[PDB]
C-alpha cells in the first residue's frame, strides 16, 4: 500500500477511473471547457499508469488530495476565471482542499441543457459514442458539483443502454423518449433527496438523522439485532456527514468500507444481500442502499412487554433515553415495513412525549398505560388518505385526478403562483399512478419517497419567494409533521378572489396542434385561474364549466375554419360561465 493513485486505478479499472476523474474535475472547475478537462483526464491517467508500473516513481507516493489540488493549481487561466479560488493555491494541503470545497458553486449560471432531436442524438451516439456520452457527463457534473460521482457514472451507463437498445429500433422516439424521461426524472429526484438528507443533518440535528435510518434500517434488515442496526446507523451518519461536506474521496472510502463490512457480516444483517455483494466495488454500496426489505422473523411478540408493561421502563429509559427510544423505534419499525419512516417517527415521538410526562407523575405505570392507543389516530390518517386517493385515482384517470388535486390545492393556498400549482398537482398525479399500483402494504413508503422531496422542494421555493404564512408554518415546524401539516390546511376563507381578466380565458386554435402534454397544461393553467377567480365554486359547478369547456374545444377543433369558432364560442363560454358562477 504505497501509491494511492495506483491503488485506485487497479480497483476501478481504467475506463471507470477516467470517467470518475472527468466528473471530479468538472465539479471543481465548472467553467473550463470540455477539451481542457479531457486533457487533464489523460494526463492524470498517463501518470496513474506510471504508478501501476512502479509504485516508487516520482510523485506516486503523494496523496490523491495532494495530486488533485496540484493539478488544479497548474491551470494557468485559474485566477482570470475563478478569482478567489486561485488564492486557495497558496495554502498547504489540509486547508487547500478545504478552500477548494468552499468555492464549489452548486446552482451555477449555466443555460439549461436542451434535449436534442432523437435522430440527432442517435447519429451522434453512433458516430462518436465516447465523446457523446462524456461531453454530457461533463455538462451534468458541472451543473451538480455535489452529486456523488459514482452515482453519476451509474446514470451514464443507463443512458448508454437506452441508446444502444433504442437507436436500432423501428420507432426510435417511441422507445427512447420514455427511457430518457424516466432517467431525467430520477436524476432530478436523486439530486433533491441528497439536498434533503443533507438539510436534515445540517439544520435539524444528527439526532433526527439517526431517528430516520434507525427506522429505515430496521424495516430493511428486520432479522438484525438492535446493536447491529446501531452500528450501521453510526457508520451511516459519518458517511453522510462526509458526503454532505462535499469531499468526494473520504465520502467514497466511507461508503466502500461500509459496503465491505455489510457484505462480510451478511449473516447478522439480511438474506437478500448476496446479489449486491457479488457486484464490483463501484456498484456495491449503491446496490445495498436500495436492496429489498428482508422478511421479518415470524415469531415476534408484542412490544407491550418491554415497553409498557415492565416496571423497570422508567429506569431503563432514564439510563439512556435515545438508546431506549431507538430500541422502541427499532422494534416498531422491523414489524412495520408497510409504514412510512415519518409515520414510525411520529409514533416514536409520541412514546417519548408520554414517557417524559409520565415518568415524573404519581404512578407512572398507570399514566402511560394506554399509550399504544395513542398510535392509532396517527397510523390511520396516512392510511385513510392513501386509500381514498387511490380509489379516486382509479375512478378518474391520471389526468382527471391531476385536475382533482389541482382544485383542492388551489383552494387550500390560492396565493401560490399558477405554474407552481400546476407543476405540483401534475407531479402528485403521477405519484398516484405509480404508488397506487402497489398493494396497500407498500403504498405508504412509496408515497413518502415522493412526497418528502416534493414537499422539501416546495418549501425551498417558498422561503425564496414567500406567499403564505400557513405554508411557511408547515415548512418550518418538524420535518416529520410536514406532510400532515399540508394535509390539514383547510380552504382559505381569507382569500380575495382574483379579478376577472379576459385574456386568461381566451383560447385560440393553436390548442389543437399542441401535444397532449401541452394541451393539458394549457387547460390545467386555465383551471387554476378559474378557481382563483371564483374560489367559492362547488365541485358540481366547476364540473359544469369544465364539461362546457371540453365541448367548446371539441366543437371548435372539429370545425371548418377553426379560429373564428374559438373567438365566437369563446365569447359564449365565458359569458355563460361568468353567469353560472
Ligand atoms: C489526480 C487526482 C485525481 C482524482 C482521482 C479520482 C477519485 C475518484 C475515486 C472514487 C472511488 C470510488 C469507489 C466506489 C465507492 C462506493 O461508492 O462504494
Ligand atoms: C450522463 C450521460 C447523459 C447523456 C444523455 C443525453 C440527453 C441529455 C438531456 C437531458 C433531458 O432529458 O432533459
Ligand atoms: C441507535 C440509536 C440511535 C438514536 C435513535 C433515537 C430515536 C429518537 C426518537 C424520537 C423521534 C424524534 C424525531 C426527530 C424530530 C423531533 O425530535 O421532533
Ligand atoms: C397515493 C396518493 C397520491 C397523491 C398524493 C396525495 C396523498 C398523500 C398521503 C400519503 C401519506 C404520506 C406518507 C408519509 C406520512 O406518513 O406522512
Ligand atoms: C412555493 C410555494 C408552494 C406551496 C405549495 C402549496 C400547494 C399544496 C401542496 C400540498 C402537497 C402535500 C400533499 C398532502 C396530501 C393531501 O393532499 O392531503
Ligand atoms: C370567468 C369564468 C370564465 C370561464 C371560462 C372557461 C375556463 C375553463 C378552463 C377549465 C379547464 C378544463 C379542464 C378539463 C378538460 O380537460 O376537459
UniProtKB/Swiss-Prot annotation:
Tell me the GO molecular function terms. Answer: antioxidant activity; copper ion binding; DNA binding; enterobactin binding; exogenous protein binding; fatty acid binding; identical protein binding; protein-folding chaperone binding
Name the gene for this chain. Answer: ALB
Keywords attached to this entry: Calcium, Cleavage on pair of basic residues, Copper, Disease variant, Disulfide bond, Glycation, Glycoprotein, Lipid-binding, Metal-binding, Methylation, Phosphoprotein, Repeat, Secreted, Signal, Zinc
- Residues recorded as bearing Phosphoserine in the entry: 3, 56, 63, 271, 417, 487
N6-succinyllysine, modified sites:
203, 434, 517, 562
What family, per the record?
A: Belongs to the ALB/AFP/VDB family.
Q: Which Pfam families match?
A: Serum_albumin
Where does the record place it?
Secreted
What functional role does this protein have? Binds water, Ca(2+), Na(+), K(+), fatty acids, hormones, bilirubin and drugs. Its main function is the regulation of the colloidal osmotic pressure of blood. Major zinc transporter in plasma, typically binds about 80% of all plasma zinc. Major calcium and magnesium transporter in plasma, binds approximately 45% of circulating calcium and magnesium in plasma. Potentially has more than two calcium-binding sites and might additionally bind calcium in a non-specific manner.
Is Phosphoprotein included in the keywords of this UniProt record?
yes
InterPro entries in alphabetical order: ALB/AFP/VDB, Serum_albumin-like, Serum_albumin/AFP/Afamin, Serum_albumin_CS, Serum_albumin_N
Carbohydrate attachment residues: 10, 49, 135, 160, 197, 223, 231, 274, 279, 311, 315-316, 321, 349, 376, 411, 437, 442, 492, 523, 532, 534, 543, 571
Q: Where is this site: Not glycated?
A: 2, 18, 39, 62, 71, 91, 104, 134, 157, 172, 179, 188, 193, 203, 210, 238, 260, 272, 284, 357, 370, 387, 400, 412, 430, 434, 464, 473, 498, 517, 522, 536, 539, 555, 558, 562, 572
Give the protein's recorded name: Albumin
Q: How is it modified after translation?
A: Glycated in diabetic patients.
Annotated residues for binding of Zn(2+):
65, 245, 247
Q: Which GO terms describe its cellular component?
A: blood microparticle; cytoplasm; endoplasmic reticulum; endoplasmic reticulum lumen; extracellular exosome; extracellular region; extracellular space; Golgi apparatus
Give the matching SMART domains: ALBUMIN (SM00103)
Query: What's the superkingdom here?
Result: Eukaryota
Result when mutating residue 267 to G = In Nagasaki-1
List ligand-binding residues for Cu cation: 1
Q: Which residues bind (4Z,15Z)-bilirubin IXalpha?
A: 238
Reported tissue expression: Plasma.
Q: What is the effect of changing residue 61 to N?
A: In Malmo-95/Dalakarlia
Q: Which disease is it linked to?
A: Hyperthyroxinemia, familial dysalbuminemic: A disorder characterized by abnormally elevated levels of total serum thyroxine (T4) in euthyroid patients. It is due to abnormal serum albumin that binds T4 with enhanced affinity. Analbuminemia: A rare autosomal recessive disorder manifested by the presence of a very low amount of circulating serum albumin. Affected individuals manifest mild edema, hypotension, fatigue, and, occasionally, lower body lipodystrophy (mainly in adult females). The most common biochemical finding is hyperlipidemia, with a significant increase in the total and LDL cholesterol concentrations, but normal concentrations of HDL cholesterol and triglycerides.
Outcome when changing residue 112 to G: In Yanomama-2
UniProt-annotated site: Aspirin-acetylated lysine, residues:
197
Amino acid at each position: 500500500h504505497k501509491s494511492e493513485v495506483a491503488h485506485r486505478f487497479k480497483d476501478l479499472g481504467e475506463e471507470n477511473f477516467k470517467a470518475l476523474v472527468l466528473i471530479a474535475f468538472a465539479q471543481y472547475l465548472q467553467q473550463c471547457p470540455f477539451e481542457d478537462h479531457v486533457k487533464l483526464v489523460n494526463e492524470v491517467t498517463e501518470f496513474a499508469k506510471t504508478c501501476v508500473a512502479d509504485e516508487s516513481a516520482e510523485n506516486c507516493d503523494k496523496s490523491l488530495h495532494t495530486l488533485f489540488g496540484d493539478k488544479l493549481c497548474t491551470v494557468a487561466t485559474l485566477r482570470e476565471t475563478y478569482g478567489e479560488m486561485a488564492d486557495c493555491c497558496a495554502k498547504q494541503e489540509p486547508e487547500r482542499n478545504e478552500c477548494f470545497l468552499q468555492h464549489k458553486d452548486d446552482n451555477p449560471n449555466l443555460p439549461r441543457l436542451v434535449r436534442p432531436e432523437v435522430d440527432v442524438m442517435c447519429t451522434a451516439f453512433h458516430d462518436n459514442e465516447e465523446t457523446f456520452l462524456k461531453k454530457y457527463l461533463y455538462e451534468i457534473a458541472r451543473r451538480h458539483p455535489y452529486f456523488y460521482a459514482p452515482e453519476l457514472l451509474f446514470f451514464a451507463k443507463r443512458y448508454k443502454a437506452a441508446f444502444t437498445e433504442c437507436c436500432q429500433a423501428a420507432d426510435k422516439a417511441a422507445c427512447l423518449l420514455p427511457k430518457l424521461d424516466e432517467l431525467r426524472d430520477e436524476g432530478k429526484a436523486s439530486s433533491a433527496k441528497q439536498r434533503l438528507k443533507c438539510a436534515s443533518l445540517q439544520k435539524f440535528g444528527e439526532r433526527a438523522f439517526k431517528a430516520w435510518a434507525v427506522a429505515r434500517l430496521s424495516q430493511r434488515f428486520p432479522k438484525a439485532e438492535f446493536a447491529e442496526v446501531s452500528k450501521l446507523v453510526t457508520d451511516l451518519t459519518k458517511v453522510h456527514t462526509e458526503c454532505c461536506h462535499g469531499d468526494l474521496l473520504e465520502c467514497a472510502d466511507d461508503r466502500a468500507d461500509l459496503a465491505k463490512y455489510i457484505c462480510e457480516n451478511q449473516d447478522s444483517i439480511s438474506s437478500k444481500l448476496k446479489e449486491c455483494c457479488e457486484k464490483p466495488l463501484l456498484e456495491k454500496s449503491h446496490c445495498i442502499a436500495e436492496v429489498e426489505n428482508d422478511e421479518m422473523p415470524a415469531d415476534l411478540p408484542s412490544l407491550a412487554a418491554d415497553f409498557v408493561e415492565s416496571k423497570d421502563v422508567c429506569k431503563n429509559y432514564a439510563e439512556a433515553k435515545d438508546v431506549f427510544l431507538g430500541m422502541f423505534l427499532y422494534e416498531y419499525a422491523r414489524r412495520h415495513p408497510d409504514y412510512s419512516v415519518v409515520l414510525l417517527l411520529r409514533l416514536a415521538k409520541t412514546y417519548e412525549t408520554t414517557l417524559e410526562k409520565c415518568c415524573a407523575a404519581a404512578d407512572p405505570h398507570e399514566c402511560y398505560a394506554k399509550v399504544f392507543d395513542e398510535f392509532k389516530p396517527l397510523v390511520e390518517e396516512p392510511q385513510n388518505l392513501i386509500k381514498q386517493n387511490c380509489e379516486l385515482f382509479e375512478q378518474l384517470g391520471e389526468y382527471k385526478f391531476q385536475n382533482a388535486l389541482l382544485v383542492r390545492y388551489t383552494k387550500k393556498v390560492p396565493q401560490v403562483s399558477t405554474p407552481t400549482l400546476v407543476e405540483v398537482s401534475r407531479n402528485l398525479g403521477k405519484v398516484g399512478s405509480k404508488c397506487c399500483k402497489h398493494p396497500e402494504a407498500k403504498r405508504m413508503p412509496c408515497a413518502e419517497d415522493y412526497l418528502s422531496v416534493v414537499l422539501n422542494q416546495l418549501c425551498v421555493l417558498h422561503e425564496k419567494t414567500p406567499v403564505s404564512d400557513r405554508v411557511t408554518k408547515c415548512c418550518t415546524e418538524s420535518l416529520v409533521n410536514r406532510r400532515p401539516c399540508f394535509s390539514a390546511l383547510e380552504v382559505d376563507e381569507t382569500y380575495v378572489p382574483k379579478e376577472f381578466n379576459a385574456e386568461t380565458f381566451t383560447f385560440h386554435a393553436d390548442i389543437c396542434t399542441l401535444s397532449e402534454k401541452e394541451r393539458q397544461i394549457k387547460k390545467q393553467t386555465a383551471l387554476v385561474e378559474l378557481v382563483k377567480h371564483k374560489p367559492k365554486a362547488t365541485k358540481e359547478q366547476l364540473k359544469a364549466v369544465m364539461d362546457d369547456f371540453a365541448a367548446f374545444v371539441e366543437k371548435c377543433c372539429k370545425a371548418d375554419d377553426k379560429e373564428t369558432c374559438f373567438a365566437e364560442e369563446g365569447k359564449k363560454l365565458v359569458a355563460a360561465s361568468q353567469a353560472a358562477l
